[PDB]
Amino acid sequence: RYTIHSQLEHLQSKYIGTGHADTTKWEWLVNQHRDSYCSYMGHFDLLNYFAIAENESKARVRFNLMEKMLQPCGPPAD
Amino acid sequence: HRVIVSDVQESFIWVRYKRNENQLIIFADDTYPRWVTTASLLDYDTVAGADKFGNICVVRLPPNTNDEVD
Amino acid sequence: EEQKERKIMKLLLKIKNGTPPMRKAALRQITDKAREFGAGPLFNQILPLLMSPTLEDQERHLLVKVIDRILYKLDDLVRPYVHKILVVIEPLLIDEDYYARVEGREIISNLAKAAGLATMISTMRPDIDNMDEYVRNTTARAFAVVASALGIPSLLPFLKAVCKSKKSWQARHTGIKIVQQIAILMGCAILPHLRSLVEIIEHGLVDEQQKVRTISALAIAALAEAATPYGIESFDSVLKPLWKGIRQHRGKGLAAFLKAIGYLIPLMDAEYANYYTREVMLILIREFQSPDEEMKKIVLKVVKQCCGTDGVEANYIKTEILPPFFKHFWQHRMALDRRNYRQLVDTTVELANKVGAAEIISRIVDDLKDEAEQYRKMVMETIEKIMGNLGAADIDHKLEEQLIDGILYAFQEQTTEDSVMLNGFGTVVNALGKRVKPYLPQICGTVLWRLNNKSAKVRQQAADLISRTAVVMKTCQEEKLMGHLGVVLYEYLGEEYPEVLGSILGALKAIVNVIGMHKMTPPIKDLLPRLTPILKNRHEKVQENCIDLVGRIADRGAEYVSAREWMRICFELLELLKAHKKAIRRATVNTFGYIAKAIGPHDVLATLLNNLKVQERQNRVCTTVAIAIVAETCSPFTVLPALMNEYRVPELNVQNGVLKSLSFLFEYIGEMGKDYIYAVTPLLEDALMDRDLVHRQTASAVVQHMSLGVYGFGCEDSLNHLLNYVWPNVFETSPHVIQAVMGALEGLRVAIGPCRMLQYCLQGLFHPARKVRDVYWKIYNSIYIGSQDALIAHYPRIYNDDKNTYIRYELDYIL
Amino acid sequence: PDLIFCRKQAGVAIGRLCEKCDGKCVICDSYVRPCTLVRICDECNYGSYQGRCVICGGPGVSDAYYCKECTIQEKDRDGCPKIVNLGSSKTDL
Ligand SMILES: [Zn+2]
Ligand SMILES: [Zn+2]
Ligand SMILES: [Zn+2]
């Protein structure tokens, strides 16, 4: 039963941010927000943009984005 | 009488002003979303735009475009 | 119970003889039950299976992994068994196998970490003065290993005490040997502790025991080699006693002292190097004149190291070292040994590298005419290496005289044939280049004489000489001699020996490559009909050289042959496009390209498409390759319409062949296929909507190769149109078809953008139907793993509900 | 077929190919445009496994490559591509 194709599909499910047919809107959007914040911290001119728009320092913006990564979108249901 | 409007998340929208009926009418738009920061007109049918993420684009209306639609 | 625990430790048999899954499961089980099992039974079962005489290397590696994992869990519970572990695995530190040593080192490291430093010292202490050299040797090696595992500063006090012991010169010997083994095992990572190690061992150079003095010198040499090039401030209190000792001692001890000197001198600055080299060089000449083989092997290395430092002068070397060196070191007994032979050649090449090639070559050239084959061989090796490193810019007349005389004599009198003389001849003449005009006649006379007879190995050697010398034979403004030897080569074309045939084919190819296709003495019109039946030989060397020769002819001299013969050659070469060897395959691809360019596509493609239908699978692949080669060499503008007319024929097993051909063709031409997507789209639209599954599979392969081949050239319109026809096939239950469709979609991701793919995919991620959701999440997971960061710009806007915030506000900021 | 990929973190060892499967891509089996050099993990290059073929396991005589299509799609950025036989044991086929 051990094929390459079922090994590929199982390794895809291990990559964080990947979903299946029982993924909820909450999970999908939490993934979206988390890698959005990581990408803002990676790209230097997007961070420059936000730091000019809200009149803050870049270290302060990075710290705020880090703090927002623990619970974006609020708490889950149930 | 042509108006190019930039949207925050969508690309450019094309608008015509009908003087005699006092109307602003949309006659074209784009198929991609763009976080537009700035735009410049190159000629009567061509816009250059820039994005929040670092891209430049040029968008052109096809020659068959009817400015007078509803 | 004790009788049950072995029955559970059958986990070991599971680990040794089992598949990867069983091995991993049993590894887990034993590493979670190690503490409950205990160190007694675990090792009482592992050690016999470790010292079994039928164990293999992979099972030993697996057992090493098991020992590591159980030592991690049992941390101090092994103290009452350290001695047993060490008795079993103290060998494998001196084994002949390289991996046995590595695994023994890993086991000793993990054991020294599980137990303490104190336990290891208390267990290994008594076997330090044991009167068996073997035991002391392994104890020193194991102490070096525990030092590498626990850090040197932990073992510095024990060594400081054991190297100054007053009761056992055997213990002193063992401690200094431990320092030497530490240096050898750890390398340049000893540099922060150099001063401490040298201070521990420096009192041993003046010991009253000769064995202790010798091991101290060897340890100093090991530390210097490990520290090279840094660290010389830590060797002063040895710099003085070492030079006093080389002026006082004689024998083995002198040999060790000189080895240490030789390692220390390349560490110094210019003045120190010069001074210390003068001293060591005086005693080094006295040892130049010596009987002992080990002594001479040491002395050669010391000379090589001294003469390579910056402070030592080329003039001083020329006036003091070279006369006695060449006087005592270049003889037949030096030629007879092997290790000393290899050391002497290297020392002489490196001496030349600083003194000039002229000195060395002019000193050893006249020995090229000698009655000793091995002496001639050694001289030729040395001269060839020197002229390959430095060149001939400093060689002058009366020296080229002797050089050419000698290499000619050495080539002629060679009885046993080996590539040394061949490569020396080649290097010498190619380093001369233009300057050897006045010698080419007698050179070519010698080559012809060797080629005319002599058992065909002389012939093959002469053929290789021609091969590597033809370039300078023409660039020296000379063509009649190479034309004549090409004629006599062409006469040698029916041979009993394939390796000689390959060599003469190579010589012919080298000649036709440099000589004009015009202006040539053997005519092509008579050469090629002789070449054509050789294409049937099955020796790989013959095949490759013959095909390469025919390719060179078709490339430069196509206007001398008829399209009929070119057609026959094409159809004879066709089946070699799938040969088992990479060299034959690449040679055939090149030759077919040249011939197709020579004639044209019109009538070749006729027969190719003709036999597309009447051939079976193993022969169809070569036809597909040939079609793609023709389209690459003569533009696909001439191939595609004829190939699509073949699809117009109403027959499966023909339409499939056309589709396979198109797939491999786009894959092979690459970015050239950007002008031909619109021409092919209607065929693909018909094929992607078809009842036959193989049609759709092959058409998706075509789309994939097209989209990956054109990337960054702007065919997004054509590929969007095709994506509209690829997408309806994602609801396919057949494995190979769905696998082709997914690959086409991943190629279209690269070609079109993740934005359009995400726009197609957002439809069914939250469909009510679980099947639709399955398919769409597969597609989305592909698009997400490839280009995760580009999707930040393409996600749609999702609104806040009562409880959760889903809007991204930073992107709504305006400046 | 009981064949998977290794897919462990690859290191500084370079993959080899025997003379049968010499110019192929270790991923897609193609012969067109070898582009990127193959790295394998330290466990798959050890002891008696040093220098064996990535695809089949025979004696290696050349270096293994990724083709240009796999490089473009970034298929060189997954783990070690050595083929593992799950149906047998270590010293087996
Ligand atoms: Zn590939
Ligand atoms: Zn691996
Ligand atoms: Zn292989």
Side-chain angles (χ1 to χ4, degrees), chain D residues 16-22 53-59:
Chain D
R16 305 302 299 281
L17 288 168
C18 70
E19 73 213 352
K20 292 181 172 295
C21 27
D22 179 1
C53 179
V54 171
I55 296 177
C56 80

Side-chain angles (χ1 to χ4, degrees), chain A residues 21-35:
Chain A
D22 286 322
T23 283
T24 71
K25 195 213 209 74
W26 186 80
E27 301 168 307
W28 191 40
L29 272 145
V30 160
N31 287 318
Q32 282 184 214
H33 280 61
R34 270 175 186 155
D35 43 34

Side-chain angles (χ1 to χ4, degrees), chain A residues 12 16-22 25-26 28-29 32-33 35-36 39-40 43 49-50 52 68 73 75, chain C residues 762 766 770 773-774 777 780-781 784-785 788-789 792 795 798 804-808 810-811 813-815:
Chain A
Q12 284 213 159
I16 288 95
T18 255
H20 43 69
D22 286 322
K25 195 213 209 74
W26 186 80
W28 191 40
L29 272 145
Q32 282 184 214
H33 280 61
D35 43 34
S36 282
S39 151
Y40 305 159
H43 291 287
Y49 195 98
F50 302 150
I52 304 153
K68 277 194 281 187
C73 311
Chain C
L762 285 167
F766 302 93
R770 174 157 290 258
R773 268 190 272 124
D774 279 28
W777 277 102
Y780 174 91
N781 284 354
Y784 183 84
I785 284 158
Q788 181 257 284
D789 189 57
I792 309 294
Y795 286 128
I798 288 135
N804 294 290
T805 293
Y806 293 144
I807 296 280
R808 295 183 288 164
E810 283 85 4
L811 299 186
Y813 292 170
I814 309 284
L815 253 181

Side-chain angles (χ1 to χ4, degrees), chain C residues 277-291:
Chain C
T277 312
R278 308 265 185 165
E279 259 93 2
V280 79
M281 201 51 58
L282 163 85
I283 293 138
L284 222 42
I285 305 307
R286 180 174 57 100
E287 287 309 300
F288 272 17
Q289 215 254 319
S290 146

